[PDB]
Amino acid sequence: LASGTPTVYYIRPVDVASKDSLLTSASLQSTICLVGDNLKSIKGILFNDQAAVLNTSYITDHTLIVSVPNEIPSVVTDKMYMITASNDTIPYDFQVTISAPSVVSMSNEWAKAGEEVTITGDYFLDYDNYPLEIKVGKDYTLPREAITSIEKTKITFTMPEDMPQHEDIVVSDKYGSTNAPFQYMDNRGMLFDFDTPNSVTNEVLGNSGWHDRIIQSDDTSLSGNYMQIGNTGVTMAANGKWNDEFSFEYWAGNWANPETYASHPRLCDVADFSDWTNKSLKFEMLIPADAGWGAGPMQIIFGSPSQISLGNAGVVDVNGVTLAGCNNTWFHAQNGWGRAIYMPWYSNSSASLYDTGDKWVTVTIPLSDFNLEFDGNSATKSFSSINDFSSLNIFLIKGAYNDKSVLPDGVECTPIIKIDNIRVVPNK
Ligand SMILES: [Mg+2]
Description:
This protein is mainly beta. The protein contains one helix and 29 strands. Strands 18, 19, 20, 22, 27 and 29 form a six-stranded antiparallel sheet that branches. The two termini are 54 Å apart. The site of magnesium ion has 8 residues, from loops. Keywords: Lipoprotein, Metal-binding, Signal. Mg(2+) binds at residues 193, 195, 223, 225, 420.
């Protein structure tokens, strides 16, 4: 309608109670107001390469109100292009604020040199004028040649031989830097690597209960010894029936009276479980392709010395706790006790054989998700103290309280689950 070249003196927000009186940037879908003259000479507006929608009814010759498009720009120039009726382009420098990268998981936090590693998250956006980078520590930057592909949710790279271990990992791009919730060869909050003696009793923790599991190392090892649940040809029923062949048990204590925990210490003394709601249980896991896991949910149960211990019942420890002794009722006592139940073989109301292609993958289970009970219903008693992380059970079983079960059946299988590097780590 109007004539002349549009100008913009400044950009202000559109709502009344705004903190800002002027904007040099704006998020997606943000409604902004241009303050210039001859603004009705504007026929189109593009933010970067994204065209905006102009409502003629709210465009005076001194104010134009437009909302930033929702789509992420593919080529970012930090300019808003105003197009006149004659298709002339008038650029006004203006940045479209995009969320910083979010880092959630790494495929194998213990990946060896040469292995294909994928980092899963969101807002991994790579541009020519501003490349995304992975920085480990303070002096190392991941070479771009190691990176094979970058998608919005996944970054894929080939692990160099010399990436710094046990250091912070930062994913940075044009829109900011964010620390990864993991480290390379992460050993923080280390509980069972089955190789290194623990810091308190100078013992390499392993079996400490009734049903001892395989702990060995061979050509399939990720790092030294691993712990194995199941074996070749050992059948797991589709209904997840009780079978101690799929139970790993570490019970604190070693038949001492009084129980000093001089042997088999409490897990809460081996690693720090304070502020557990902001922490997660992590471990690396291998399931052979020929030994898929398709039935029997994995119940990971932490317990206090009041519930379970390696010894006789009635013994008191150096903490005044009356030990429960050896038992297998504490994790199914119908008392609302919370435990995590991991079941990747159950995907969208249907059960299938889950394996991991004979590779080691890192599994993250936040301690806040230990809120189920043996039957699968929501747990009524949460964690109350760090003392509740003294013993650990890993049991592949579908529980059924009072002949009723909420967890689902699977398919009959012969699963082999190799586990190493059981640790507890901060969520961030
Ligand atoms: Mg190991």
